[PDB]
Design a protein around this nucleic acid. Sequence first.
RNA 1: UGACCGAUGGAGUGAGGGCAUGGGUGCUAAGGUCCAUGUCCGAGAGGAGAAGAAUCCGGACCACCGGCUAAGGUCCCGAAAUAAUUGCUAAGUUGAAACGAAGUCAAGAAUUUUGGCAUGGAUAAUACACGGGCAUAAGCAAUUUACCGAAGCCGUGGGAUAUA
Lengths: 104, 141, 150, 35, 56, 77
Amino acid sequence: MYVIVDIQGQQMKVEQGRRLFVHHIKDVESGASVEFDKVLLVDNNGAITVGSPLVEGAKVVCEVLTPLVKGDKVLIFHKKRRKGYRKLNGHRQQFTEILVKEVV
Amino acid sequence: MLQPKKTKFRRQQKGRMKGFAQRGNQLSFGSFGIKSLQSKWITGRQIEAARIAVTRYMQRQGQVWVRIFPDKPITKKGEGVRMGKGKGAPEGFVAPITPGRIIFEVEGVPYEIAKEALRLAAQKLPVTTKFVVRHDYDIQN
Amino acid sequence: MDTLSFKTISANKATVTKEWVIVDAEGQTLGRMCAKVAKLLRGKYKPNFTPHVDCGDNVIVINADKIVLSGNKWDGRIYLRHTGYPGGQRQFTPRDFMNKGPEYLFRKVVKGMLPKNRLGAKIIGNLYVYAGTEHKHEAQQPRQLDINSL
Amino acid sequence: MKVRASVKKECKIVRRKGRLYVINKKNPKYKQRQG
Amino acid sequence: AKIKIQQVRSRIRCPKDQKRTLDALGLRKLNQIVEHEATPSILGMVNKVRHLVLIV
Amino acid sequence: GSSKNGRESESKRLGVKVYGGEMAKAGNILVRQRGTVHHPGENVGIGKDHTLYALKSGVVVFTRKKNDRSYVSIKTE
RNA sequence: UGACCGAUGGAGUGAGGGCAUGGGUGCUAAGGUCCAUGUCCGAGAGGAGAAGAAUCCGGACCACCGGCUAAGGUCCCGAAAUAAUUGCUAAGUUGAAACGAAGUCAAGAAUUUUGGCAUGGAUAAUACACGGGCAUAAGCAAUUUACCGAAGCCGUGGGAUAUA
Ligand SMILES: [K+]
Ligand SMILES: [K+]
Ligand SMILES: [Mg+2]
Ligand SMILES: [Mg+2]
Ligand SMILES: [Mg+2]
Ligand SMILES: [Mg+2]
Ligand SMILES: [Mg+2]
Ligand SMILES: [Mg+2]
Ligand SMILES: [Mg+2]
Ligand SMILES: [Mg+2]
Ligand SMILES: [Mg+2]
Ligand SMILES: [Mg+2]
Ligand SMILES: [Mg+2]
Ligand code: NA
């Protein structure tokens, strides 16, 4: 059983007990229960349902394991040759890790 | 040469020919004629060549009118002369013409060879032409 | 560390699904048939297509001499080449290629619709062109394909 | 045989191999090419 | 009464009087929608920038 | 060759400074002209160089009459 | 909108250039030169045009393996229609003129005019071009619908700078 559902504006394929990384969810704690009810597809080991106005009654319950996971550093470099303009910044994307408990 | 005897100023600015002729586009004084389809300067040498061509044909009957007169003076710089330092040497006169202006016209002549005399005249001009006839002319003279 | 957790998988040498197909050139146009053959060789018809892997099909073309060139192309299309010496430009025609052999004409057309790199140079070797309907490709069990369906 | 940009016509105008000809077998000094 | 004007084309290479008309209407971004009373002055601005806007 | 030309004089900034309908004060210059292109009327004076000015405050009025002559006057109160 | 105006601290610039329009000059030449009104390059990245400073679209805070579009496109190299319908072209035209036949379709009038598409005029030196394969449509003209297509717009996460 797997469902296609979107979490923070991005669609993911999820099963039971998966340990996803999603875009940062603000004001949460370790062990907090988050809910996402915008499933687009449900595949129950052979039976497939597709929802135009989502799939009615479908639901994904998750628990927060880490409230702030930072990604790998990316160097941001701007340069225009022969003009002297040059700057170099650093960026780290922010994620939260969740574990999926029940897939309705 | 076909040119004025006197002018107030010896020099003239090169203007801009703009649209279609709003005068001198209808046939007065005559029966057959040619109109120009393009905008151009016409030299007196070209005009005299065209008139000589149209009058060698047609023998000497009928009447021939040229309806443009060259009165715009033009200059030319010369060989080895660089840009600047005023206007160049005079090089005659030209007539500026626009589309729809009647250049040559003929009268008192059979249609079938007026059509040929005017074509002979029009082959010695730097503009494309169009044959025109009076809107009251009848086949039986 | 990896924060993606939902990736698109690329096929590799052990995961491709390579097949032998047989297509016919009985009355098809040369360029129109060869474009579909190039798509077959590249693997554009497979849902696991991967542009950095040889993931296409081995194609056998039969009845190659029955191919059709419209217009005056059989002698009016001038191919030019150069020997590298001064005054060394030469001309030839699709008729000259056909006289030499249909496989040469088909290879010349398909190389030109294939990508211009090492992978395409490897791909062009998966094509087999035969003049008649008789060819010897046992032990691989090729599958007949209707090129007009594509 | 005379070749000129504008060819014109008992001489007859024919088209051969994408070229224009004006031919007259009675008088061969009036043949023309490339109309 | 109230009408809706949406900018659909870029202001790049347009003359400054047209750019200032867009500012006076209140459009500073592509695909932006503003709402205004259909007074003759507003209609005149819309006429001036008609090739850049859509009435939605 | 050489050119026998190349001379000019400075422009004199002539023209109408205060148009019809505007408010003028006493002594304001209304028109700069060469000759009486416009003529003085009520409460409008003319200077040495034919400059039109307002004797009193008020509103500038331009009016035309016979011979298409143009007059400039000040309407007060 | 918000930066218009005053007063004060600090400047840089005072070699410009392309395109469009109105002109002068030149030869109604020049990637020429001198002015005026706009715009862009200068100081401007991204997309299409094969490859191009200023032609067409479009102004880049950072990240994303999300979505919609612009110009321009949807046979293969190369993302998306070998989509649908109606005509024209036979020249591989396609993806430079006076001046000649009129090859062909269409609309007329009393031989003749009229436009559409072609054809001859049409031309030098290391090997040549629709970018290439190649195409009789995958050319040209018209219409309709889907789709592709950018750092433009929207979505999600994260910063910064001001006005309230
Ligand atoms: K090109
Ligand atoms: K494609
Ligand atoms: Mg003066
Ligand atoms: Mg200086
Ligand atoms: Mg200077
Ligand atoms: Mg210059
Ligand atoms: Mg110029
Ligand atoms: Mg500089
Ligand atoms: Mg700029
Ligand atoms: Mg660019
Ligand atoms: Mg879309
Ligand atoms: Mg994008
Ligand atoms: Mg943006
Ligand atoms: Na001067």
